[PDB]
Amino acid sequence: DKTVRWCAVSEHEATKCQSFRDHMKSVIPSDGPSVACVKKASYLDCIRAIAANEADAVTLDAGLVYDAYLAPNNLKPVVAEFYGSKEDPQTFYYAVAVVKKDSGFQMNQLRGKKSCHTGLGRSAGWNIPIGLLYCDLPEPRKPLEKAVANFFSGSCAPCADGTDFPQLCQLCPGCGCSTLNQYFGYSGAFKCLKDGAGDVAFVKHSTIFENLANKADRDQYELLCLDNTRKPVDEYKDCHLAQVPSHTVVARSMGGKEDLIWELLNQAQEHFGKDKSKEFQLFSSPHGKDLLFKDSAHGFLKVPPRMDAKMYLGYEYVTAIRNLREGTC
């Protein structure tokens, strides 16, 4: 079988997936890999669809690769994004806290603010900033959601349960887990800050550059540094919360079609990759940012075949995510 069933998360992704499928048909020979689109309501539905042999591939933030590995889904990373450039491929990025200039507060003054997160469980939007915060609370509210809900004065945490924790959806009611939620993802969390809904956006170092083309506009923003100071958004290298690994395509650990997923993706970056074509762009869309893959990605690299999720993420990140979810301090 030469079809890779790609899992698209809701409507904008499904639109781009269809364009992906149709543009690959225009350049890959008829005996080559083809794209079929499967649409689901959230990454987690895609994880389950893949484990159940209803879909083959989906791209996940590395924090979500954790959930993807857990039994009984047992998926594995097979193809990783890289950032930066072909010339120096980065398989990491920086988690940063973006704030508006002249809002005055520092990192130790986040209590009571309104917070914009990319989504529950994601590296920059959640695992890093909450992972740094949780234990350092004097309060054992500590199985996360309730503790974060009380610490901030209202949030948008896409994919959180708004019935159980309404505070975490105050800025984005329903906490929708797809780009139909306008405050989902890196650029949704940035808009949440830009719009004045929240006081801080937990996103990545490219995010503000993806959204504000003009240096004068960007000058109205700053980064919160862990030593309770602020720096210009250009100085993320010296002012970030953490470095985290690349988003990656996951697949079944057995019968995953990983070899065919690589073939589809490699041939796709060849024809429609970074600045390759004006007919189609793997890495951007008129339909939204970060659909199917990150806009900030410049291409794909194959994951070594021995490497399971825990090896991909590494010991410190797997341990932190495990500890963060158990509230162990």
Binding residues for Fe ion (CB under 5 A)? 61, 123
Which residues of the chain form beta strands (DSSP E)?
3-9, 34-40, 58-60, 75-84, 89-90, 92-100, 115-117, 155-156, 200-204, 221-225, 229-232, 242-245, 248-252, 297-302
* Residue written as token pair 């060849």: 270
Query: Nearest distance from residue 97's CB to Fe ion, in Å?
Result: 14
Q: Which is nearer to Fe ion, 61 or 67 (CB)?
A: 61
Q: Which is nearer to Fe ion, 61 or 258 (CB)?
A: 61
Query: Nearest distance from residue 90's CB to Fe ion, in Å?
Result: 13
The pair phi, psi for residue 143, each rounded to 5°, is: -65, 60
Query: Nearest distance from residue 22's CB to Fe ion, in Å?
Result: 28
Three-state DSSP class for residue 73: coil
Bridge partners of residue 229, in order along the sequence: 225
118 assigned binding-site residue = yes
Q: Which is nearer to Fe ion, 13 or 61 (CB)?
A: 61
Query: Nearest distance from residue 61's CB to Fe ion, in Å?
Result: 4
93 assigned binding-site residue = yes
Q: Which is nearer to Fe ion, 170 or 246 (CB)?
A: 246
Residue type, 98: V
186 assigned binding-site residue = yes
Q: Which is nearer to Fe ion, 61 or 295 (CB)?
A: 61
Query: Which residue number has the CB closest to Fe ion?
Result: 61
Query: Nearest distance from residue 187's CB to Fe ion, in Å?
Result: 12
First and final C-alpha spacing in the chain: 48
Q: CB 157: neighbour CB atoms within 10 A?
A: 33
Give the C-alpha separation, 181 to 195, whole Å.
14
314 assigned binding-site residue = no
Q: How far is CA 329 from CA 7, 133, 145, 160, in A?
A: 36, 11, 16, 22
Q: Which is nearer to Fe ion, 125 or 176 (CB)?
A: 125
Query: Nearest distance from residue 119's CB to Fe ion, in Å?
Result: 9
- Binding-site positions read 61, 93, 118, 122, 124-125, 186, 247
- Binding-site positions for Fe(3+) read 61, 93, 186, 247
- Binding-site positions for hydrogencarbonate read 118, 122, 124-125
